Each structure stands twice: as structure tokens, then as C-alpha cells.
Symmetry: D2
Subunit: 347 residues, 4 copies
């Protein structure tokens, strides 16, 4: 069958206590799939949802997590092109209204009535989770769900971000936070897109990981006292594009100073209460764009999962049990997560 | 002939005393035209060069002014396609190196070795001024030089800025400072480009001018206490594009908040020591680009002067004498300049 | 109620006999609206569907017409954001699969499983017609349905085509067939988009109409023996963009020769068995793009209907009865349709 | 010194007799470099110039060749940033007017007064050749001139062509003629740009070369009777982009049929008297662009030579003597040139 009770990590108040307990199995709405979430990536956005670091409020009590890879155990009556047993991906964008100007254009993420897994919708830190069938990701059969789970928010995000920077092949892309969860996949997406990857990160295991996944230049922010000058030399004038997948505001500000003239600084990371204080003179006389970038749409999901399918991207994951989700968060705020963490909801 | 002495407004120290006295007539270099500057637009950048409001240093003693419209009285030996008597325009970009990556691409303004009239090169607040012949603007014969002078920095700038905002016809463009020197021409360029122009300015004669030149919605910043909300209503979700041609940093910051999702806030105005402190969360979840924009290139100059030629743009100018240049600056810092001021170098 | 029988123009074989008789009222599927089609534009595509001029086969017996403007008299159970009494527009794209790569990207028209009103789906030459609710056009209340009907295929088409030509404001756009049904709206969309409109058409009432709707240069193909030379002079080097809304193949070929270097020739008209024989040398040494363009998507529909709402476009329509649909087709093959014809389904 | 006589291959009438004899050494004009052409690539455009296969006429008597890599032995007085001994590249675009709208925009190749090496200017099939210093390619020191010579017309061309197809990383690019001189470099540029390369060529040594340089799918046009169907399967719907670097018109036409919906067929090859007869219906209902592409500009030259510098592209060259240039042409019309031929002007 589909059971009545399931295991999930749920918190009832912000920065309170994540309880791995038994919660009721959700019922899929007319348009939603019920997905047996096998593995789920643990994004930093989940730490932000728990701490309430962001302006928007979350749907308490909340089962976070928005990188779920699972099998469709049930569907709604109005779900059309989906089978039971198919591989589905719960992304951050649970669904959207698919009618507003933004949605029609393609910008489904920047939509007023966009449902958000792991914030406004009980996400994928649970064995069974519902997801709007139009926005759920189609994961090909015979795919390692643990390996594809981080591609559902980190992969599509950094793919849309690297497309957001208006880079060309051969252009320098500085990925700020290049050994984190999103940065370690941005390095691989950018190399597969043709760019020269510069990496800025620091800590135990960060430079080694960055060199592992194919990065070109690594600049350790805990050792480099002049980061802007270091990325004004490595790059020969600045990085034609910058991807801020850090959780630091000082990194977001330095990225505006080591970007090339006519370059694009994409803001992807969303630290708590951070502002991108950009010098107006330097941004104008260099014609620097500062582009915010939200999670990708269905087209970006298809393209990022296709990059994953060809074996070009491979997020460095450690699969732990869902029981361990408290200890991941306390390991994620301390910057000690090298690559991605994926939780076995079973365990 | 070409005389030995000429009249020019020259200052020897920043925010010192602008002296309208007799200075030697320059000699055109091998690549430069000597232009009998008949009329010259007075930009706010000239007030910034005098006050030294900007990071870069100016070439003291300096004859400012970078909107000169004049006749070519002499040329250099290596100048090719130019006649004596032709109408030339001294723009902010006096010249460029025309060899570096940026110059080759087309971004001649963001070039390391770009010569700048009215900053690093004795500009057009003088009867005779030299200008690199490759970057000088070709003004058609039978043109009102007084009327075309403001198009040489304000016009090409706001044209490149409106092209920088990635707007489409019918999209809302909020021009911040829409009755100033650059804003009053941005309103006209945007309407001729097809956009719905919202205007934000305030003071005596600003709303009336804005309504004169064809603006749609005017929002008076000295009366409107909620500017962001007012431009979130007029526009129905925010302005698809914003052009910051203000000299205020609070305007630059509010423009990041009343821009539409997936909209572009172009920074054109460069107030003294201003920073574009942008909320990272709001910029990311709305995918807002913040694009700096410098003066246009030769293509943008050609296209903006073609817009002027068809009679579509007409900067509201008051032609005073060059003798009056001190009194313009003290009228420009006080925000009391409605439209543009143009100086008769003769007078 | 909703009646059992209705009046419609139906043909049972290609180029057979259009019978205005009583046909059963359709039943809306789970996703479809039943639209009381008040007025319907008569496109040339309907003449092509009747003659079978196109490669694809039509769904016999067929009730053509794909420019229906009507009120929603009934809906399906899975239709979400729609009211009874709302104004809906049956476009050529009746619906789409909204799942394939093209649909996800935004290209809903170039979709393998795209349902097509007036070809593969009983269209809008009938009092009551069904239309997929996701693709039906939202026509604002208090709109002249007769006046908005031609905007449902001609308007969105020529809007997407003018966006397809990668034109800028001030650039020359040669609309081939500028007094026809699509050309007369392309002239107005292009002028509202900022372009200089050149018009090529010929016959009684074509030049007068073209001058009426705001065209700049008219070149009469029945009087001009050198059309390419005439549009190499008017334009000063060729038209930066060309829109082929003709039903002639010689026009489609000449458009490749009077387009500017680096210009774009958009093919919109689809004459019977026509080929765009383009000289490869001239297309390469001038870097001329030849872009085919299909009907617009939901975003283009929204933007074109917004242009119509502001009063910027106004298709020259003559509203006749649906009874007269045979006599329109025989007037449309002879090129004698100046502007658009709209049929009162009531009459 | 610089000698008075030199060795060059010169023909006095079209398809006449190429004579390797002693011709006078040219004198550099005020803006031109005299380049000791060490090695020169032999393009098919040189065979077209000899046969007079193209509409434009050549400058008889003509020393063809437009892929010269050499050292600057002398300069003109108005040449600015150049040294004697530097490595210069004579490309097809010898120079341009650098003042017309196209040149200002960046499209220096599609310019009315563009000087063309190997057609309108004695090219690089000679020991000493002059080249406009603004358009000459800057080849880094310590570069294999024989290996960089084919990058001067083939490399920059196929780079600009792959940028012309509006492809994204992961998209399918079908290179028609993928083992020829331009195709063998288009395969490498496309793989370094991130695309999946499909190759269409045939003959001895073509499939082996294509597999050597990193191609994914090879489709042999002499064995495949259904080329369109084969490239509608390999690609799963058609190639998102096609690069026609063939010398066949049937290939140019089939490329319009095996391109994906919303795909771009770039015409690069310019066979004799060829026309791109494109079905208008299929091009419109699939929104297929057919983009002609001429040699790249200075920015594309810089970017293609940078790709070469990183070791990412490596044209398969055979360096023969200049004495052998007749036997290359008779080997190039027969399609028997696998990769590129480079002539030692010394030999
Ligand atoms: N905008 C979007 O679409 C989107 C999507 C996913 C995540 N995010 C946001 O991205 C942020 C990062 O997510 P993650 O999963 O990569 O987090 P993570 O904690 O796994 O990785 C962050 C990385 O940043 C590095 N870093 C810290 N300070 C730095 C500095 N000063 N300079 C450079 N690098 C520095 C850390 O050492 C670590 O390597 C979070 O705020 C998350 O919410 C945004
Ligand atoms: N980036 C470029 O290429 C470029 C080119 C030219 C000028 N500029 C810069 O643009 C700035 C403005 O130049 P200008 O000639 O338009 O100056 P101006 O003084 O003539 O006009 C400025 C306008 O801004 C209005 N304004 C002031 N505070 C405002 C606020 N809070 N909100 C909205 N509007 C406000 C003023 O009332 C006035 O109408 C200067 O700093 C100048 O150096 C930049
Ligand atoms: N691709 C699309 O999305 C799309 C959409 C709608 C219509 N169409 C096609 O567009 C074509 C035209 O449709 P319409 O409604 O405008 O037709 P129409 O018959 O109302 O107008 C055609 C116009 O072309 C003019 N014309 C004829 N020969 C010409 C020539 N040699 N040069 C210039 N002009 C010439 C006619 O005189 C007339 O003015 C049809 O084939 C139709 O199917 C395509
Ligand atoms: N537009 C430009 O900027 C530009 C630049 C350089 C060359 N060109 C033109 O490109 C053409 C090719 O130049 P090249 O140096 O590559 O020539 P080449 O002769 O060295 O190579 C041509 C290749 O096409 C292959 N081919 C032949 N028939 C084919 C078919 N039916 N289908 C697929 N492949 C086929 C041949 O076997 C060979 O592999 C010439 O006409 C040249 O003038 C254009
Ligand atoms: Zn996430
Ligand atoms: Zn929405
Ligand atoms: Zn200025
Ligand atoms: Zn430069
Ligand atoms: Zn139609
Ligand atoms: Zn589809
Ligand atoms: Zn060549
Ligand atoms: Zn030129």
C-alpha cells in the first residue's frame, strides 16, 4: 500500500528542535504526485528556513527539504503524463500558478503564487512528499537517486546562474564558495559549459575537493588577504562572470570588485540580512551587472538533469541517515560541509 | 586663421575658482581634430569633475565640458575621413585605444586607456578643443548645434542605458530624475523606443517639463512619501526597467525596490561616494539585475544622433554664455536645473 | 442554456463547398472552455486550410477559423482560473502539451502535439467552439470583440515576428504585404515598437490603407519594377528587418535581397508550396538571417493584447456575416482584402 | 634587409595557371604592416578565388591566400601598437574602413569598403605580404606559426559561426563537412564550447579524423542515403544548431531539414552559385533560422586565438611547400583534403 504514518524531520518553531518522528502521510491533491522520497539533498536554504534567516515566513510546523528524489507511489486525478514508479524530483519550486506574466514568460520561480517545498509546503525531509506534477522533475530511469538529489536545487540553480552571467566559452568565471554544496556543482557546470573556473573557498578539504572536480584556479579566502587583487591577476583584469554561492556578505561585496569590466556578478547565495553594497562609481564606469538568480525553471531543470545524465556533473555527496539531520545543520552553519549531504529518509 | 588665444573656463584646483580667461589654443595631435566649439552642454559630470566627487583624479589645470558641438577648423595628418567645416561632437569619451579586448568588442568607454574630455583632457568649455577623430561624433550638416550639444553626453548615455535595461516595447520604464538633464532626454528616448515612461522628480518646473516632453506617470519625490509603493501601483508590479539618472543615493536604492521581478535597474547617475546597497534576498528571489551603464560607443552615438535627427528627441535647453558657467554649477548642485544648460563659448 | 444545435461553416473535403448549416454544439473536455464565439477573424490560413495548400492534413469535416473572440459560456472540470462570462480568445494554437522541451522553453507553437484550431480542431467559424483553457487568450472586459478578434492570430503573429527580427528602435522594417490582414497590423505593431515602417503592397485601397495606419514609405509592387532597388534606397542600404506577410514566393525571395547586411528576414506568410531560395553567397557575405516565425505563445499573446488595449493597434476590419464566408475566401485569394475581415457568427 | 624580389604563387586570369615565380616585395602603406609570411593556410576560398566561383571579382593579377602567419619585418608610419619581430596574422579581412555603421557596431567583415586578402589584396601565398595593422591578428610569441595559420580564417570563421547558431552547452551541433578544413576546426571549437558534435562527411580518412579530433556522432554522407533521418535520430528531434562548412548545395539544403525546431542553420560554406532553397512551410512551422556567417571580427579573432593558445583546438595540418600550391587546389576540388593544408612559403 501507501502507509498511514511515516518518518519525517519536523520543527514547530524557528531555530527550535528538529524532531525525527512519525507524521501522517500526505494526500496528493488533484494536481500533485505523492513521491516516495528515497534520498534528499540538504541545502543551506533548509538551514535558512530553520533559522528563519529570510524575510518570508515558513509554514509551521514544517518538514523542510527541497531536493527530494523518489518514486511516484501515487498521483492525483488531474495529473496527466506521469506513471506510478517513475522517478520524480521535488525541487524548491514545488509548483507555480502557470498563468501569470512571469510564469507565461518562463520565470516560474519569480511568481507571486509559487509554492515552495521546504518553506511553504512540507518538503522532502520525509519519506512521502507531495509535489505539483507540472513542476516536478523528470528523473530518467536507472538513475542513482542519491547522486541526482543534489542536482534538484543546487544543480538547476547553478546552471541557471551560469546562464545568467552571460558568459562565453573561454571566459573566466569566479565561483565564490566553490567547494560548498552549490559551488562544487557550479564548478562542474561551468567547466562543462566551457568556462575557465576560478574558485574561492577555504577550510579543511575545500581546496582538495575543488581541484578534484576540475577547477582551474583556487584562491583560499582564509589565506588570501587580498582576494580582489588575487582574482584581478589570475583572470587578467577580473572574472568575466562571478557566481556568489557563498553564505558570506563580504564575499558578495568583493565579487563586485574583482569582476571584469562589462562582467556580471550573479548573486545566488542569500545570507541572513545581507545587502550587496556596490560602489556606484565603480559599477558604472565598468558597466558591471549585478544579477540576482533564483532557482531554474522546467527548461533549466531538464538541461541540468541532462548534464547530469551525460556524466558531466557529479556532486560530491555523503549519504547519511535522515535521523542525522540535526547534526548536518550544525555542521552546515560552521562551513564544514565539503560538497553536499544527502539524507536516506529510510535511515 | 585659427587664433593664438581663446576664451575658456579653467579651474586650477578642485572646488576652487572657475576663471573665464584667455588660454592658448590647443594644437591637434596626429589623430585629433581641432573643433571650434560653438555650443557646449553642461553636464552634472562637470560639476563632479570640479568638486572632485569621483574616485579618479582630473587633469589640473582643467577646462571641463564634454558635450561640445562645433565645426572642424583643423585636423591632424593621420585623420582620414573628415573635412574642414564639418560638424563634430566632443563627447565624454574623447578617444580610446581601439585595440584592447573591450574596445574590440565595442565597449570603448570601459577601456583602461580611454581619454576623457572634461576630465583627463581639456574639454569643451573653451572655444577650440581637440578630439580624437575616431571617437568624435559626426553631426549632420544643417543641425542646430545648441540643440544637438546635450545629445553628445546625455543623449547617447540614456540611449545606451535604455538599451541596457533589456526592455521591450510596452514595458514600464521608471526614469528616476526624469526632469533633469539626462532624465529629460531619457523620457524622450524611451517613448521613441516604445516604453511607458514613469517619471520621478521634484521641484519647481519638474513635473511640468516632464509632462511637456511626453511622460506618462509622474511621481514627485518631494511630495510622495511612499515612492516604492507609488511605483508598485502605477506600473502594476514594478517597472520592468529603471534608469537612475538622479544624483541621489536614496533614489538609487529605492529603484532596486520598485523594479519588477526580472527587471533591470540601470545605474547611470554617479553621485559622490554613493553605494547601491541592495537587499540580497529581494534581488535574488525577484532575479533583479542592477546594471551599471557608461557613456555609449560610436554605434550608440550614431543611433542617438539619428533619433535626434528625426525630431524625436529635443532636449529642453537654455543657452547662456560661457561667462555664466560658475552660476550654472551653483544652480546645478541645488537641483534647480530643469532640463539642460548649454553655454555659448562666444559669450 | 447552451443550445443543442448551432450555425457553423463546415466543409467536408478540401476546396469543396463551405456549407453554413446547423452542426452540434461541442462539449468542452476536462481542460477546455466552451466559448460563445461572437466574432471571428478570417485569416488567410483559413483559405490555406480549405485549399489544402499546406503539407499537414486537416481534420475533415472541418469548421475552420482560429481568431475567435467570445464569452465563456461553459468550462471543464479541470479548468482553474476562468469565469463564466469572461472574454476568451480562440487562437491558432488551440492548446499544447505543456510538457515537451519546446513547451517548457516557451515555444508552445512549435510543439509536436500542439492542437490547432481551424485545422486539427473545429475552430471559430461557428457560434460555440472549445479551446484549451491554458492557451486561450484572456481578453479584458469591456473590449470590442470584433476589433480584438484579428489580434488573436494576426496581431500575436506579427508581434512575435517583429520581435523575431532582432530590430531596434529607429531601424528600418520592410513589411512585405503591408496592407493585408497581417501586414496592416505589423505596420502598427512596428511603429508602436519604434521602427521605421516601409510597406510593400499593391492594388486598390492598399497604399491608402497603409498611409492611414501610419506607414512611412510605401512601395507598390505592381508599379515598382525594381523593388529591391527601391528598398535599397528608401532604407539607405536595406531594411534592418523584413517581415514577409505576403502570399507570394517572389516577395519572399526579394526580401532576402533588399534586407540590410546583418539584417533579418522573417518568414511569416506561408504560400502554397513556396521555397525561400536564397543566394548562399549574398546571405553569407552579408550575414543575413532568414528566420521563420510561427504564432506567438501566451506571453506574446498577453503583450500583443496589451498593445491593443492601449489603443496603439487597430486592425482595419469589415464585419460581415458568417453566411458570407465563401465570398470572403474568393475575395481573399484575389488579394482584394484590404485589412481584415471579421464574421458575425450570429449573422 | 627586406629583399627586392620574393617568391609567390600568382595567377593572371581566373582558372588559368598558378605560377610560383619571383614578384616584387610590397611596400607597406601608412597603416599596413609588412609581414614575412612564414606559413600560410590554404582555404577553399582560395580555390573559389582562382576559379572565380563567386559573384565578386578578384584583383588580377592576384597572389591568393588569406591565412598567413608571419613576423612583422616592417611597419607603416601611422601603425601604432606593433613591434618589428611580432607575430602577425593576415586574415581574410585584410582591413576595413572602421567608420561605417557596420564597422562601428562590430561587423567589420560585412563592410562595403572591407579590404580582402587573397581577393582584392595580394594575400599570403607569398613570402612578404602587407596587412592593415588594425585588423591583423596578434599571434602570441612562442607560437607554432604553421599550427596557428589555419586558425586565421578557418578558426575565427567557425568560432563566429558557432556563436551565430545561438547554441547552449549540451545542445546538438551538426557540422556538415566535419572532416574538411573548416569542419575539423568547428568540431573542436564546438566541443570546447560545450556542444555535442555530430559530424557529416565522407571519403578516405574523414571518419577517422573526425573521431580523432573529438567528435561524437559521425554520419557518412556517401554511405548514409537518409542523412536527414539519421540526424533526426542521433540528435533526438534534430540538431539544435547546424554549421554548413561543406562545398555542396545539397548539404546546405538537407541542413534545413535535419535542424531542430527553433534551431539555427548557419551557412558558412559558399559553393559556386549555390542557393539555400528552404521550404517556407517547414521553416515557419518550426521557426528555423538560417543565418549566414562571414569571417569573424577582431574580438572573434582574439577569442579564437585564445582557444588555440590554451591547446583546445589543433587543426590537422600538412605543411607542404608553396611550390605545391597547384597540386593542393586540384586535391581540394576533389574533396581529398583531410583537415588543412599549410604552405611553407620558403619551400
Ligand atoms: N538563489 C538560489 O536559487 C539558491 C539556490 C540554492 C541555494 N541558495 C543559497 O546559497 C547559499 C549557499 O548554499 P550552499 O548549499 O552552497 O551552502 P554551503 O554552506 O554548503 O556552501 C557555502 C560555501 O561558501 C563558502 N564560503 C563561506 N564564506 C566564504 C567567503 N567569504 N568567500 C567565499 N566562500 C565562502 C563556505 O566555506 C562553503 O564552501 C545559501 O544561502 C542558500 O540558501 C540560493
Ligand atoms: N553613467 C553615465 O554614462 C553618465 C552620463 C552622464 C551623466 N551621468 C551622471 O548622471 C548624474 C545626473 O546627471 P544630470 O545631467 O541628469 O544631472 P541634473 O542635476 O541635471 O539632473 C538630476 C536630476 O535628479 C533629480 N533628483 C534629485 N534627487 C532625486 C531623487 N531622490 N529621486 C529622483 N530624482 C531626483 C533632480 O531633481 C534632477 O531633476 C550625474 O551624477 C552625472 O555625472 C552619468
Ligand atoms: N507564420 C505565422 O504565424 C502566420 C500567421 C498568420 C498567417 N500566416 C500566413 O500569412 C499569409 C498572409 O496572411 P494574411 O492574413 O496577411 O493574408 P492577406 O491575403 O489578407 O494579405 C496578403 C497581402 O500580401 C500582399 N501581396 C501579395 N503579393 C505580394 C507581393 N509580391 N509583394 C508584396 N505583397 C504582396 C497582398 O496584396 C495582401 O496585401 C498566409 O499565407 C497566412 O497563412 C502565417
Ligand atoms: N563564410 C565564411 O566566413 C567562410 C570562411 C572560410 C571558408 N568558407 C567557405 O567554406 C567552404 C568550405 O571550406 P573548407 O576549407 O572547409 O573546405 P574543404 O574542401 O577543405 O572541406 C569541405 C568539406 O566538405 C565535405 N563535404 C562535401 N560534400 C559534402 C556533403 N554533401 N555533405 C557534407 N559534407 C560534405 C568535404 O568532403 C570536405 O570534408 C568553402 O566554400 C569556403 O570558401 C566560408
Ligand atoms: Zn536549495
Ligand atoms: Zn505564476
Ligand atoms: Zn555628461
Ligand atoms: Zn581600449
Ligand atoms: Zn491566421
Ligand atoms: Zn509540447
Ligand atoms: Zn578562408
Ligand atoms: Zn566599414
Amino acid at each position: 500500500s501507501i502507509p498511514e504514518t511515516q518518518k519525517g524531520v519536523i520543527f514547530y518553531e524557528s531555530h527550535g528542535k528538529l524532531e525525527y518522528k512519525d507524521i501522517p502521510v500526505p494526500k496528493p491533491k488533484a494536481n500533485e504526485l505523492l513521491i516516495n522520497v528515497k534520498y534528499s539533498g540538504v541545502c543551506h536554504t533548509d538551514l535558512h528556513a530553520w533559522h528563519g534567516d529570510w524575510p518570508l515566513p515558513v509554514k509551521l510546523p514544517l518538514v523542510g527539504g527541497h531536493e527530494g528524489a523518489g518514486v511516484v507511489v501515487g498521483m492525483g486525478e488531474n495529473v496527466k503524463g506521469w506513471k506510478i514508479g517513475d522517478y520524480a524530483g521535488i525541487k524548491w519550486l514545488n509548483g507555480s500558478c502557470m498563468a501569470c506574466e512571469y510564469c507565461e514568460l518562463g520565470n516560474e520561480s519569480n511568481c507571486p503564487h509559487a509554492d515552495l517545498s521546504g518553506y511553504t509546503h512540507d518538503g522532502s525531509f520525509q519519506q512521502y512528499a507531495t509535489a505539483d506534477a507540472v513542476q516536478a522533475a523528470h528523473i530518467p530511469q536507472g538513475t542513482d537517486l542519491a547522486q541526482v538529489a543534489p542536482i534538484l536545487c543546487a544543480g538547476i540553480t547553478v546552471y541557471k546562474a551560469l546562464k545568467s552571467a552571460n558568459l562565453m566559452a573561454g571566459h573566466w568565471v569566479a565561483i565564490s564558495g566553490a567547494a560548498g554544496g552549490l559551488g562544487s556543482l557550479a564548478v562542474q557546470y561551468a567547466k562543462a559549459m566551457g568556462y575557465r573556473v576560478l574558485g574561492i573557498d577555504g577550510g579543511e578539504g575545500k581546496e582538495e575537493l575543488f581541484r578534484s572536480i576540475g577547477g582551474e584556479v583556487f584562491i583560499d579566502f582564509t589565506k588570501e588577504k587580498d582576494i580582489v587583487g588575487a582574482v584581478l591577476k589570475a583572470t587578467d583584469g577580473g572574472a568575466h562572470g562571478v557566481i556568489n554561492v557563498s553564505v558570506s556578505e563580504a564575499a558578495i561585496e568583493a565579487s563586485t570588485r574583482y569582476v571584469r569590466a562589462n562582467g556580471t556578478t550573479v548573486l545566488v547565495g542569500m545570507p541572513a540580512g545581507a545587502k550587496c553594497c556596490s560602489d556606484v562609481f565603480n559599477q558604472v564606469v565598468k558597466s558591471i551587472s549585478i544579477v540576482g538568480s533564483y532557482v531554474g525553471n522546467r527548461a533549466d531543470t531538464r538541461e541540468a538533469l541532462d548534464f547530469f545524465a551525460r556524466g558531466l556533473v557529479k556532486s560530491p555527496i555523503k549519504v547519511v541517515g535522515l535521523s542525522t539531520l540535526p547534526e548536518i545543520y550544525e555542521k552546515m552553519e560552521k562551513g564544514q560541509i565539503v560538497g553536499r549531504y544527502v539524507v536516506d529518509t529510510s535511515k
